């Protein structure tokens, strides 16, 4: 069972949010596939890690209200770097 939920990360006092992402695809069916931005790695002791509500394999649907379903990896990274100390992520998990 999957679920879309919201996760806010605050990197105050940390070097970065701690997420590494990649463009990926999963088969939503049985005869179709969906593409998107997925969390490929999480940095230990980073906000993403300490949060505990973000998992490797989760897909990022939006960032601070911006749809990133079809964004390039670099575009999402730029968006994150343009943010202050916080980013609100719409996450699809499980």
């Amino acid at each position: 069972g999957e679920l879309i939920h919201m996760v806010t990360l605050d990197k105050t006092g940390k070097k970065s949010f701690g997420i590494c992402i990649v463009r990926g695809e999963v088969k939503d069916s049985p005869n179709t596939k969906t593409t998107g931005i997925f969390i490929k790695g999480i940095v230990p002791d980073s906000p993403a890690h300490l949060c505990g509500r973000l998992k490797v394999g989760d897909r990022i649907l939006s960032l601070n209200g911006k749809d990133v379903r079809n964004s390039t990896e670099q575009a999402v990274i730029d968006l994150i770097k343009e943010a202050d100390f916080k980013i609100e992520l719409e996450i699809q998990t499980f």
Binding site: S16, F17, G18, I19, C20, I21, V22, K40, G41, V43, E73, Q74, V76, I77, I80, K81
Partner: peptide
């Protein structure tokens, strides 16, 4: 690993 923030 590229694309981390």
């Amino acid at each position: 690993t590229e694309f981390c923030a």
